[PDB]
Amino acid sequence: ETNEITIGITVTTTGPAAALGIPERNALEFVAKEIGGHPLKVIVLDDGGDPTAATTNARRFVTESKADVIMGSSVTPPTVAVSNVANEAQVPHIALAPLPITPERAKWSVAMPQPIPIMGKVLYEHMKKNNIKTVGYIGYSDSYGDLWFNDLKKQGEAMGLKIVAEERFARPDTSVAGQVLKLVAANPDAILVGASGTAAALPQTSLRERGYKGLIYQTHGAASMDFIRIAGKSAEGVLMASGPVMDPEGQDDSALTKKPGLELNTAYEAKYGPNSRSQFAAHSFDAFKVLERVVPVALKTAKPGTQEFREAIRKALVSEKDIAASQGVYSFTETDRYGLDDRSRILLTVKDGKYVMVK
Numbered sequence: 001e002t003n004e005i006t007i008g009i010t011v012t013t014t015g016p017a018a019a020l021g022i023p024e025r026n027a028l029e030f031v032a033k034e035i036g037g038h039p040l041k042v043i044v045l046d047d048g049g050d051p052t053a054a055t056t057n058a059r060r061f062v063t064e065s066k067a068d069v070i071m072g073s074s075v076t077p078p079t080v081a082v083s084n085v086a087n088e089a090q091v092p093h094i095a096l097a098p099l100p101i102t103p104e105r106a107k108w109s110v111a112m113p114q115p116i117p118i119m120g121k122v123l124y125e126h127m128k129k130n131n132i133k134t135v136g137y138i139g140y141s142d143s144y145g146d147l148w149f150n151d152l153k154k155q156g157e158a159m160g161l162k163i164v165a166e167e168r169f170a171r172p173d174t175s176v177a178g179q180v181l182k183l184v185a186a187n188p189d190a191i192l193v194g195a196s197g198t199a200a201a202l203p204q205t206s207l208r209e210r211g212y213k214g215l216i217y218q219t220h221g222a223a224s225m226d227f228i229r230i231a232g233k234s235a236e237g238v239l240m241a242s243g244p245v246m247d248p249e250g251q252d253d254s255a256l257t258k259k260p261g262l263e264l265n266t267a268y269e270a271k272y273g274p275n276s277r278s279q280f281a282a283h284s285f286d287a288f289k290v291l292e293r294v295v296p297v298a299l300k301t302a303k304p305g306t307q308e309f310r311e312a313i314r315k316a317l318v319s320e321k322d323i324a325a326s327q328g329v330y331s332f333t334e335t336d337r338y339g340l341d342d343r344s345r346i347l348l349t350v351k352d353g354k355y356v357m358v359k
């Protein structure tokens with residue numbers, strides 16, 4: 001057993017997904033340094049978004065650092081890898097990307113990002129309030145893109161959407177020209193883009209450049225000012241699912257998410273400048289808010305640096321209810337590994353080069 005509580009974090013600070021991981025790493029400056037008087041020993045590694053590196057990193061944490069908790073990664077593929085390692089090694093894992101948490105992954109993994117169906121629902125609800133009958137999809141040719149397309153199909157169709165076109169692209173692709181020509185030809189009333197970070201801006205710019213006039217909808221993987229920096233004028237009028245951390249100012253004081261959002265954004269934006277808030281910084285910040293709640297519970301009955309403590313953290317994640325954080329109010333169960341509800345999302349648009357919450 002140790003005095004310190006050991007937390008390993010693998011995030012993507014190089015490569016195309018660096019725009020997600022950099023804020024996640026930077027937010028660590030503003031989290032707890034100590035819980036219950038026990039210093040937190042936080043070990044941070046880059047995985048480059050590569051599942052192999054993330055597997056290596058997670059394993060370094062669980063065996064070499066004897067971590068009590070592991071966190072990461074920034075995008076879905078390395079996040080699945082971390083979950084594989086955490087469930088084998090029996091170490092609690094807080095995911096920072098929204099992976100499919102299957103029965104094989106559920107025991108030791110929970111997720112900070114909003115689950116795809118919560119975010120889909122708020123987008124499709126807007127679609128059906130704004131005369132959208134036909135919808136096209138463009139998203140990744142991998143698990144994240146699949147989760148979004150499957151949700152559009154299942155949930156979206158049931159709400160009165162007809163899917164008239166489906167196109168995919170790979171994360172590293174620098175053009176989506178062919179896919180966009182087909183989408184523009186199909187001319188759906190709206191298009192849903194299933195992507196994240198820099199790649200989310202690519203269909204935004206390509207669609208507007210290549211003549212698309214309909215509404216464009218973006219996932220919560222796009223929610224940072226970076227999207228507007230890259231897409232520019234093509235971002236105008238976009239509808240975007242976001243966590244509430246993007247606008248704590250617009251929340252009522254009664255919102256449990258308001259205080260922790262104001263705390264993170266004030267700290268982050270003091271160092272990195274106005275409107276540098278992000279969806280992503282909030283996930284690592286919120287993971288520590290969760291630790292603030294569950295670690296004192298585990299400390300009652302178990303010593304840090306032991307399996308008993310790992311197990312106590314696992315049990316506490318589902319005994320401790322209504323954990324307030326900047327992105328939502330979490331109540332995990334044995335079967336619900338996201339634990340979120342409507343308090344975890346707002347809808348954004350872009351007007352005059354800035355985000356505005358849609359009332």
Ligand SMILES: O=C(O)/C=C/c1ccc(O)cc1
Pocket residue numbers: 020074075076077096097098113114144195196220221222279280
């Ligand atoms: O690129 C992915 O696989 C998805 C990234 C993502 C990260 C944080 C979110 O809150 C949503 C999506």
Ligand SMILES: [Cl-]
Pocket residue numbers: 293322323324
């Ligand atoms: Cl709380």
